[PDB]
Amino acid sequence: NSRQEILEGARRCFAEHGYEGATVRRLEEATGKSRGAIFHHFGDKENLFLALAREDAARMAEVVSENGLVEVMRGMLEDPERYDWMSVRLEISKQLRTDPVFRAKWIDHQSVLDEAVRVRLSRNVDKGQMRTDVPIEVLHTFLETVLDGFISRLATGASTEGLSEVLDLVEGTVRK
Amino acid sequence: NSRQEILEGARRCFAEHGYEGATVRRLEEATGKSRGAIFHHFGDKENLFLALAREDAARMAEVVSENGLVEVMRGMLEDPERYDWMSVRLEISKQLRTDPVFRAKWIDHQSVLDEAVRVRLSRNVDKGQMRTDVPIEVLHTFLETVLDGFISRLATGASTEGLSEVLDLVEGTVRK
Ligand SMILES: [Au+]
Ligand SMILES: [Au+]
Ligand SMILES: [Au+]
Ligand SMILES: [Au+]
Ligand SMILES: [Au+]
Ligand SMILES: [Au+]
Ligand SMILES: [Au+]
Ligand SMILES: [Au+]
């Protein structure tokens, strides 16, 4: 599968050199595929990057499905090989605000994850596991917010110590 | 005060063009000061950037002092003119992990803020406002984590709606 070779390779060139530093030539080196093979499949570097971001959204969506966003974060605690790639995701923050087409592409590529959270939370509410003194959307934004904070600290090299107890506290904050 | 002119100007060139895009020539344009005047004061672009980051640490430290990290975040909700600069801070995440000298410089430049949090939390514990079923350091990491999540969502252009209720919930999670 040539698409999946390109994506596994790209995730590494990106992880090691960052967004700007993943040149087309370096992306050939990491993938064993030509400029033409790469752009044929994905059009441009930005769409390649978004496809990877979609892969994270699809895997996180499965995890969320099973056991919510606390579980994604628990898993993030176990996957230190993923922190360089998380760095890259944070680098494009500026573009996510200066560029409406990219921003819309980013949001669309994240939609599978966004839907899974809504479904997971809805089923939790349906089963009476979530606290009902706080609106569910506030719980949602709360957990989104902790997630983004987790990605950021891990990305920036902060220690993982006490984050596990932070997670126990996040759970307790939103459950009955 | 030529140092403070350079810093006010730099904060804007950075906010508008991002880290890479704030060239030396553009930083002259934003500041009205020469390459030589800029490097005389700060040595290099990285130290200039760190000085700005220290300015945030010093202002946040004051706010934290008064009313803790929830208050910094409440203020962040009121300061949408600051979100482009927050973007820039997130761009260097990758360097914060690939570069130990920068990482140490970053941490040292943040130390005034880190100390203020410890002092604020210690005085809260001393006055019996914090919950005592959870270790205080876990509360600390929790609040650090929410903060970084707040910076990240605002930076990336997410909406500020329900973050205010998120803050009420964060407060309630850590107080008695
Ligand atoms: Au690379
Ligand atoms: Au959940
Ligand atoms: Au996971
Ligand atoms: Au990720
Ligand atoms: Au600029
Ligand atoms: Au506090
Ligand atoms: Au503030
Ligand atoms: Au800031």
Curated annotation (Swiss-Prot), chains A, B:
<dbReference type="Pfam" id="PF00440">
    <property type="entry name" value="TetR_N"/>
</dbReference>
<comment type="subunit">
    <text>Homodimer.</text>
</comment>
<dbReference type="InterPro" id="IPR009057">
    <property type="entry name" value="Homeodomain-like_sf"/>
</dbReference>
<keyword id="KW-0460">Magnesium</keyword>
<dbReference type="InterPro" id="IPR050109">
    <property type="entry name" value="HTH-type_TetR-like_transc_reg"/>
</dbReference>
<dbReference type="GO" id="GO:0000287">
    <property type="term" value="F:magnesium ion binding"/>
</dbReference>
<keyword id="KW-0804">Transcription</keyword>
<comment type="function">
    <text>AcnR negatively controls the expression of the aconitase gene acn. Binds to the imperfect inverted repeat in the acn promoter region.</text>
</comment>
<feature type="binding site">
    <location>
        <position position="124"/>
    </location>
    <ligand>
        <name>citrate</name>
    </ligand>
</feature>
<keyword id="KW-0678">Repressor</keyword>
<feature type="domain" description="HTH tetR-type">
    <location>
        <begin position="1"/>
        <end position="60"/>
    </location>
</feature>
<dbReference type="GO" id="GO:0003700">
    <property type="term" value="F:DNA-binding transcription factor activity"/>
</dbReference>
<feature type="DNA-binding region" description="H-T-H motif">
    <location>
        <begin position="23"/>
        <end position="42"/>
    </location>
</feature>
<dbReference type="GO" id="GO:0006355">
    <property type="term" value="P:regulation of DNA-templated transcription"/>
</dbReference>
<dbReference type="GO" id="GO:0003677">
    <property type="term" value="F:DNA binding"/>
</dbReference>
<keyword id="KW-0238">DNA-binding</keyword>
<dbReference type="InterPro" id="IPR001647">
    <property type="entry name" value="HTH_TetR"/>
</dbReference>
<protein>
    <recommendedName>
        <fullName>HTH-type transcriptional repressor AcnR</fullName>
    </recommendedName>
</protein>
<dbReference type="GO" id="GO:0000976">
    <property type="term" value="F:transcription cis-regulatory region binding"/>
</dbReference>
<feature type="binding site">
    <location>
        <position position="175"/>
    </location>
    <ligand>
        <name>citrate</name>
    </ligand>
</feature>
<dbReference type="InterPro" id="IPR036271">
    <property type="entry name" value="Tet_transcr_reg_TetR-rel_C_sf"/>
</dbReference>
<feature type="binding site">
    <location>
        <position position="120"/>
    </location>
    <ligand>
        <name>citrate</name>
    </ligand>
</feature>
<keyword id="KW-0479">Metal-binding</keyword>
<feature type="binding site">
    <location>
        <position position="171"/>
    </location>
    <ligand>
        <name>Mg(2+)</name>
    </ligand>
</feature>
<keyword id="KW-0805">Transcription regulation</keyword>
<feature type="binding site">
    <location>
        <begin position="69"/>
        <end position="70"/>
    </location>
    <ligand>
        <name>citrate</name>
    </ligand>
</feature>
